[PDB]
């Protein structure tokens, strides 16, 4: 509710004590914070924040500014820059603190931190952060709250279980979190003095030497700065190298993009650390026997085993038929690409790959198929596709689907071959894969059925419905069947909604009620025309 | 990861200097936080949380307990206590501080506070808690970044608009989550000794009357 408006001093001191540890493991309320923190620009902002019972967002940041300095000797300078915002956004190269007022007006007499919750910003990957942290912060908490509150006990309100289900839908629906951000390389995050000195020592074309750095070649502080910069670079490249998109929650296109991305990134970083600057930095730090940095660089590459992990190039062997599929618009070329990609998947046998990842990618390929064949059938315009042409295009599509079903069975055989490999290590043996195109195909196949019967229902009208070939019921029933036919023809087509199939089923049971009316009429004509004899028109 | 691990002492002292600023709004560490320091189970759970990268979540629950009273007509007092939680739980009348590693790898040289992620919760209503906090935490920030980072111009992931609709329907459902106070029936407190005298004189098969308490019927402090 609305209460007394808190003062600047109490919360200012609170945040001043809280920040420096959370920001740089210390600092004890740095003066750069207090400079613009006490500024009227921030002061009136926070006065409005406390007073207005409508704003509950704020963002106090402290960017470690990378001040580019043009003076000769170094490239950049570390800087401190406190920033004030009333809205929350991704601060670049900084972590921020947000404060949400749980009470629309906050006072100091009640605890400010009790009526206001604290958030701290992530700069490395804010989206992955926020997702994983809200999951781990609410999903078990909300489950425990549901259990203790007995929401399952009172069935009058059943929306809390649904909101738990949709929280789960969020948490398992987006795992990529805009993964594969395509970070191929960065700048050199090491000591700038050495880099610049070596730059002028090499632009002269005289092979930068040990002595030209002066005492810095053996200075303990200079070598420590080199070690810190090398450690920062090695940590950054480790972070970028350990990135690996989850095979699920994505697509085959995402997988191939990630594969090519990591390939080119490792290609460029295996050519970047070989620059003379890095070599001379390592040499002159080891000159002072800085062996820890050397062994870290030797062991913290973290890319070699990844290099053999990507040394399989049958991935591209499959990717080429994947591009053929993405370019495919006709069924024959579609299962030609399927045959090719199956052959390449059989060829993957000689290489090493995570088998669960491979199975997930196979399922992703199956649903990518489902999607492209769906757009193909939509292109074929089945909404009013003619009878015989519907059957013909169905024969083509269904034989293509049977070819891909044979491919699926051969993939199961390849999975048995995988298990033949797997007796080398004997890990988990759980397999479950099912493309949903089945249901699509399900609808497909059932439509075929009505088409068949409708053909049978046409000629007999000229034959059995015609009077010995009454006229009134004859005309009535032909109008019945024709209007019901146009109804079941324009009611549903390339439509993929299964509830559309159910509505079609209702339409066809009305169809069949007219059919059975015709059956009763023709059988009545039968029986009233019977009783004479057996021969020909009698029976 | 485990290459360098922050010590128990440094992290525990950081929490000791951090908690009172939040759960007392700038106060000083109480005897509950002293127990938190000395709680061997907490002492081992924080070590497991800091070391094991399998779980990056820890929760400290400054609990309020219904302290029994002997006063002259004044209801039972509340005593501040502490609880440790590797996982997270629905705390009741017990404030909570959650610490989940923003940086999955654990390094003592890396600033531990800048290696961790700080959340907190006071028990007023989980419904409005989750709704308002997710709203003012993700809506402006998420839409601001997707609009400003050029992702709205990137077709690599149309995942973002779908999850925007997802966030919106979270906020809708959680704001409509305002139905029940959820206070159907609570235990009736009188006093321990009267209740146990009644139970012990009835379990024998006898009706409790004024006589069983004996002297307790005319004791002004007891009454």
From Swiss-Prot, chain A:
Coiled-coil annotated spans: 162-183, 436-459, 501-524
Effect of substituting residue 75 to K: Found in a patient with spinal muscular atrophy; uncertain significance
Signal sequence range: none
Compartments where found: Cytoplasm, Cytoskeleton
Domain of life: Eukaryota
Positions of modified residues (Phosphoserine): 51
Residue pairs linked by disulfide bridges in the UniProt entry: none
Function noted in UniProt: Cytoplasmic dynein 1 acts as a motor for the intracellular retrograde motility of vesicles and organelles along microtubules. Dynein has ATPase activity; the force-producing power stroke is thought to occur on release of ADP. Plays a role in mitotic spindle assembly and metaphase plate congression.
Disease: Charcot-Marie-Tooth disease, axonal, type 2O: An axonal form of Charcot-Marie-Tooth disease, a disorder of the peripheral nervous system, characterized by progressive weakness and atrophy, initially of the peroneal muscles and later of the distal muscles of the arms. Charcot-Marie-Tooth disease is classified in two main groups on the basis of electrophysiologic properties and histopathology: primary peripheral demyelinating neuropathies (designated CMT1 when they are dominantly inherited) and primary peripheral axonal neuropathies (CMT2). Cortical dysplasia, complex, with other brain malformations 13: An autosomal dominant disorder characterized by global developmental delay with impaired intellectual development. Some patients show signs of peripheral neuropathy, such as abnormal gait and hyporeflexia. CDCBM13 is associated with variable neuronal migration defects resulting in cortical malformations.
Subunit structure comment from the entry: Homodimer. The cytoplasmic dynein 1 complex consists of two catalytic heavy chains (HCs) and a number of non-catalytic subunits presented by intermediate chains (ICs), light intermediate chains (LICs) and light chains (LCs); the composition seems to vary in respect to the IC, LIC and LC composition. The heavy chain homodimer serves as a scaffold for the probable homodimeric assembly of the respective non-catalytic subunits. The ICs and LICs bind directly to the HC dimer and dynein LCs assemble on the IC dimer. Interacts with DYNC1LI1; DYNC1LI1 and DYNC1LI2 bind mutually exclusive to DYNC1H1.
Family to which the UniProt record says this protein belongs: Belongs to the dynein heavy chain family.
Protein name from the UniProt record: Cytoplasmic dynein 1 heavy chain 1
Native species: Homo sapiens
Gene behind the chain: DYNC1H1
Whole sequence portion shown: 20 to 581 of 4646
UniProtKB/Swiss-Prot annotation, chain B:
Compartments where located: Cytoplasm, Cytoskeleton
Modified residues (Phosphoserine): 51
Coiled coil: 162-183
Subunit structure as annotated in this protein's UniProt entry: Homodimer. The cytoplasmic dynein 1 complex consists of two catalytic heavy chains (HCs) and a number of non-catalytic subunits presented by intermediate chains (ICs), light intermediate chains (LICs) and light chains (LCs); the composition seems to vary in respect to the IC, LIC and LC composition. The heavy chain homodimer serves as a scaffold for the probable homodimeric assembly of the respective non-catalytic subunits. The ICs and LICs bind directly to the HC dimer and dynein LCs assemble on the IC dimer. Interacts with DYNC1LI1; DYNC1LI1 and DYNC1LI2 bind mutually exclusive to DYNC1H1.
Swiss-Prot/TrEMBL domain comment: Dynein heavy chains probably consist of an N-terminal stem (which binds cargo and interacts with other dynein components), and the head or motor domain. The motor contains six tandemly-linked AAA domains in the head, which form a ring. A stalk-like structure (formed by two of the coiled coil domains) protrudes between AAA 4 and AAA 5 and terminates in a microtubule-binding site. A seventh domain may also contribute to this ring; it is not clear whether the N-terminus or the C-terminus forms this extra domain.
Function (record text): Cytoplasmic dynein 1 acts as a motor for the intracellular retrograde motility of vesicles and organelles along microtubules. Dynein has ATPase activity; the force-producing power stroke is thought to occur on release of ADP. Plays a role in mitotic spindle assembly and metaphase plate congression.
Known disease link: Charcot-Marie-Tooth disease, axonal, type 2O: An axonal form of Charcot-Marie-Tooth disease, a disorder of the peripheral nervous system, characterized by progressive weakness and atrophy, initially of the peroneal muscles and later of the distal muscles of the arms. Charcot-Marie-Tooth disease is classified in two main groups on the basis of electrophysiologic properties and histopathology: primary peripheral demyelinating neuropathies (designated CMT1 when they are dominantly inherited) and primary peripheral axonal neuropathies (CMT2).
Family affiliation: Belongs to the dynein heavy chain family.
Protein name (database record): Cytoplasmic dynein 1 heavy chain 1
Higher taxonomy: Eukaryota, Metazoa, Chordata, Craniata, Vertebrata
Residues included from the entire protein: 20 to 242 of 4646
């Amino acid at each position: 509710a609305v209460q007394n408006v808190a003062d600047v001093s109490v919360l200012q001191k609170h945040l001043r004590k809280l920040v420096p540890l959370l920001l740089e493991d210390g600092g004890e309320a740095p003066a750069a914070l207090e400079a613009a923190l006490e500024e009227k620009s921030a002061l009136e902002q926070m006065r409005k924040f406390l007073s207005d019972p409508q704003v509950h967002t704020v963002l106090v940041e402290r960017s470690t500014l990378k001040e580019d300095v043009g003076d000769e000797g170094e490239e950049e300078k570390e800087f401190i820059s406190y920033n004030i915002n009333i809205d929350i956004h991704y601060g670049v190269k900084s972590n921020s603190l947000a404060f949400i007022k749980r009470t629309p007006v906050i006072d100091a007499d009640k605890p400010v931190s009790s009526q206001l919750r604290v958030l701290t910003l992530s700069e490395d990957s804010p989206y992955e952060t926020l997702h994983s942290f809200i999951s781990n912060a609410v999903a078990p908490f909300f489950k425990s709250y549901i259990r203790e509150s007995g929401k399952a006990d009172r069935d009058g309100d059943k929306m809390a279980p649904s909101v738990e289900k949709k929280i789960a839908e969020l948490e398992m629906g987006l795992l990529h979190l805009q993964q594969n951000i395509e970070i191929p390389e960065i700048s050199l995050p090491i000591h700038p003095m050495i880099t610049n000195v070596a730059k002028q020592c090499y632009e002269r074309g005289e092979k930068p030497k040990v002595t030209d750095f002066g005492d810095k070649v053996e200075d303990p502080t200079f070598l420590n700065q080199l070690q810190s910069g090398v450690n920062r670079w090695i940590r950054e490249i480790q972070k970028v190298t350990k990135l690996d998109r989850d095979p699920a929650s994505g697509t085959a296109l995402q997988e191939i993009s990630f594969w090519l991305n990591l390939e080119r990134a490792l290609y460029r970083i295996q050519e970047k650390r070989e620059s003379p600057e890095v070599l001379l930095t390592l040499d002159i730090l080891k000159h002072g026997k800085r062996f820890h940095a050397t062994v870290s660089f030797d062991t913290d590459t973290g890319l070699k085993q990844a290099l053999e992990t990507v040394n399989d190039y049958n991935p591209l062997m499959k990717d080429f038929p994947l591009n053929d599929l993405l370019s495919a618009t006709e069924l024959d070329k579609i299962r030609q690409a399927l045959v090719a990609i199956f052959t390449h998947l059989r060829k993957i046998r000689n290489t090493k790959y995570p088998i669960q990842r491979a199975l997930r990618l196979v399922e992703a390929i199956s649903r990518d198929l489902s999607s492209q064949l769906l757009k193909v059938l939509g292109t074929r315009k089945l909404m009013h596709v003619a009878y015989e042409e519907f059957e013909k295009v169905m024969v083509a599509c269904f034989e293509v689907f049977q070819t891909w079903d044979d491919e699926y069975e051969k993939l199961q055989v390849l999975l048995r071959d995988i298990v033949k490999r797997k007796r080398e290590e004997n890990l988990k043996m759980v397999w479950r894969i099912n493309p949903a195109h089945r249901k699509l195909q399900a609808r497909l196949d059932q439509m075929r059925k009505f088409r068949r019967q409708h053909e049978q229902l046409r000629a007999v009208i000229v034959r059995v419905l015609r009077p010995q070939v009454f006229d009134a019921a004859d005309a009535n029933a032909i109008e019945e069947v024709n209007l019901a036919y146009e109804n079941v023809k324009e009611v549903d087509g390339l439509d993929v909604s299964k509830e559309g199939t159910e509505a079609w089923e209702a339409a066809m049971k009305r169809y069949d009620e007219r059919i059975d009316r015709v059956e009763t009429r023709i059988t009545a004509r039968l029986r009233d025309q019977l009783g004479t004899a057996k021969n020909a028109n009698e029976m």
